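so i finally got all the pieces together for this one. its two components total, 100 residues if u count the protein bits. some of the lines might not be protein, just check the labels. i wanna see the whole assembly predicted at once instead of chain by chain like last time, that was a mess tbh
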Amino acid sequence: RAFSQIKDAMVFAFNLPAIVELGTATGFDFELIDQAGLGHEKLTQARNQL
Amino acid sequence: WGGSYVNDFIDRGRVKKVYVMSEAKYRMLPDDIGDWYVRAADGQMVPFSA
C-alpha cells in the first residue's frame, strides 16, 4: 500500500509461498498456443480478446 | 548436381532448410556436364572440358 503512491513504477512486495519450488496460488496457468500461420500479431489479437 | 543447403529461411515462423541446386533438366545425362563453366580469375568463362 505505502508503495503505491509511487510514480509510474509498479512496486509490489509479497511473501514467498510455502514450498518455494512448487504449485503456488490455488490459481490457474493457461497458455494460449498458436496452431497455424497465425502470427505473433494474430495470437496477440486472440490474446487480448480472450 | 548434389544439392547444397544454404541456410534457413523462415516459413510462417518455422525455421527452415534452403538449397541451391540444378533445375532438373540441366543435370540428367553426362552430356549435360557441359552447361557448366566457371569464372576463373581473368573473368574468363572457363568450362569443364577445359
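The two ends of chain A are 30 Å apart (CA to CA).
Chain A is about 20% helix and 0% strand.
anyway lmk what u think
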